[PDB]
Amino acid sequence: DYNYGEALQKAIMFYEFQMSGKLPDNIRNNWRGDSCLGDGSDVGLDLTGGWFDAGDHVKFNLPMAYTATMLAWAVYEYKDALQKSGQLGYLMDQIKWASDYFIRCHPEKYVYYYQVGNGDMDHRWWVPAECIDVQAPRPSYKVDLSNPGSTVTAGTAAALAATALVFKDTDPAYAALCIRHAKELFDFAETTMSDKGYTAALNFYTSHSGWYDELSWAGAWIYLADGDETYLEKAEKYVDKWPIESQTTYIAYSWGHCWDDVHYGAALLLAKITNKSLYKEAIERHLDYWTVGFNGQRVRYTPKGLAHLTDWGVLRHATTTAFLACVYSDWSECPREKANIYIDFAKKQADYALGSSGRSYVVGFGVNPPQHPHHRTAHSSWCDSQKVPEYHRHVLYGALVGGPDASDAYVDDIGNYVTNQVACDYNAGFVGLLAKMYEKYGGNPIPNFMA
């Protein structure tokens, strides 16, 4: 099969290319430099760090927090396989990079900065990250009690709780700090029950499915990290306000786990914590609908076997559902017949990202990978133009692209920010999927690999 170790190595390295702020000397590549060192200056804070969201230089905290949580989840489930691959250290460094930034965004219990950079203005400039902050201001945006944002604060709480979970055995003091922040952010979200102040991300990362699944998401992670039963109880309380499948009274099953809908993953977590049939039925309904089908309906598939939920970041969706399939099928309480269907599904989605259709969809990996991702800093224009140079100056190793259409059709095109898009949330579940594939099938990573 494909070299899952190499793919895992590169999928993790992808995040180094997304880093904002003062880079550590530990970094492997030689083309990224310090950037956006004034972030937060407009409000007197150090809000540097974190990840650029996609091929732009806005820091969008909702997908950033989702990403950090998923990366931590990969460590939690597959620590041993990640240590064997030699990549656990790099992944842990990235998790802490994001969470260090979330902490800086939380200077008071009820004040949280959820964005740095203006979307419309950042996107007018096709310039690399080391030059972006010379061309336009970069305002900071926040929510408070008078102007709240329950979705993003609860999402960040989940990220910091999961970070403490995986750092507990390494940096107890850091885990205790993350936990303290996570519980405060959760209270902030639950007390306000509103997204009125979550405005700067409008038309970029608007919350459409509600903050109640983010509360269950965060509550489960806080319980797994601290054991505080208060947050497990609250998690179960808000299940009744998760999205429901239209024309039914079921919990929604026909979409997938993503930055805007985290109730799928929360249902998996709450299943393993409590072993209640409510959560087991809901997740198995989901994963059944995505494999064999459920009640005569089934997620659509391309003829070449890709589970194709929607045209926007299709590989993101298929590899993230595949990751959830890995976790659930590894669980002893998963029916045996189901586990083999779910893990077969997961491997075929991984193989499709890596080359099964005839080409790889991971930049810098496999056969004929994408070469022109919609990414300003890997391209590196010298004149504010997507077309100049006609080849990217730098290889964005590990980046999973948007992907093909429902008939397996795709073409490289730097200008298509749907098919050729790359982003933090695209690679997040992907990392966890590749960890499992490495565990079960191996493939060695490249020795002494540097970009």
Ligand X SMILES: OC[C@H]1O[C@@H](O[C@H]2[C@H](O)[C@@H](O)[C@H](O[C@H]3[C@H](O)[C@@H](O)[C@H](O[C@H]4[C@H](O)[C@@H](O)[C@H](O[C@H]5[C@H](O)[C@@H](O)[C@H](O[C@H]6[C@H](O)[C@@H](O)[C@H](O)O[C@@H]6CO)O[C@@H]5CO)O[C@@H]4CO)O[C@@H]3CO)O[C@@H]2CO)[C@H](O)[C@@H](O)[C@@H]1O
Among 83-91, 162-170, 253-261, 274-282, the segment contacting ligand X (CB under 6 A): 253-261
Round to whole Å and give the CA distance between 57 and 76: 29
* Of the residues 220, 258, 350, 395, which one makes contact with ligand X according to CB under 6 A: 258
Among 54-62, 79-87, 287-295, 390-398, the segment contacting ligand X (CB under 6 A): 54-62
CB of 197 to ligand X, least distance (A): 19
CB of 52 to Ca ion, least distance (A): 23
Contacts of 107 (CB under 8 A, 6+ apart): 45, 113
**Cα–Cα separations (whole angstroms), residue 449 to 15, 27, 95, 361, 375:** 15, 12, 20, 20, 22
Q: Does 122 contact Ca ion by CB under 5 A?
A: no
Round to whole Å and give the CA distance between 388 and 279: 51
* Contact flags string 195-214 toward Ca ion, x per CB under 5 A: --------------x---xx
Task: List the interface residues with ligand X, window 182-241 (CB under 6 A).
Answer: 204-205, 208-209
Judging by beta carbons within 10 Å of its beta carbon (0-12, 13-18, 19+), is residue 1 exposed, middle or buried? middle
Among 135-143, 173-181, 338-346, 416-424, the segment contacting ligand X (CB under 6 A): 416-424
The strand ranges marked E within 131-250 are 140-144
Using an 8 Å Cβ cutoff, are 223 and 229 in contact? yes
CB nearer to ligand X: give 39 or 56. Answer: 56
* Of the residues 5, 49, 55, 148, which one makes contact with ligand X according to CB under 6 A: 55
Q: What are phi and psi of 157, to 5 degrees?
A: -60, -45
CB nearer to Ca ion: give 266 or 343. Answer: 266
* Of the residues 6, 56, 133, 226, which one makes contact with ligand X according to CB under 6 A: 56
Round to whole Å and give the CA distance between 224 and 220: 6
Task: List the interface residues with Ca ion, window 213-242 (CB under 5 A).
Answer: 213-214
* Of the residues 35, 67, 420, 421, which one makes contact with ligand X according to CB under 6 A: 421
* Of the residues 33, 86, 139, 243, which one makes contact with ligand X according to CB under 6 A: 243
CB of 62 to ligand X, least distance (A): 10
Q: Does 284 contact ligand X by CB under 6 A?
A: no
Angle between helices 336-354 and 314-330 (to 10 degrees): 150
Q: Does 423 contact ligand X by CB under 6 A?
A: yes
Give 39-42 contacts, CB < 8 A, sequence gap 24+: 39/116, 39/133, 39/138, 39/140, 40/104, 40/113, 40/116, 40/140, 42/137, 42/138, 42/139, 42/140
Round to whole Å and give the CA distance between 426 and 213: 20
Burial 163-179 (b: 16+ CB within 10 A, else e): bbbbbbeebeebbebbb
Count of residues engaged in binding Ca ion, rule: CB under 5 A: 3
Round to whole Å and give the CA distance between 136 and 119: 11
Residue 312 binding: pick among Ca ion, ligand X, none (C-beta 5-8 Å cut-off by kind) = ligand X
Q: Does 410 contact ligand X by CB under 6 A?
A: no
Q: What are the residues binding Ca ion (CB under 5 A)?
A: 209, 213-214
Q: What are the residues binding ligand X (CB under 6 A)?
A: 54-56, 123, 126, 204-205, 208-209, 243, 255, 258, 260-261, 312-313, 386, 417, 421, 423
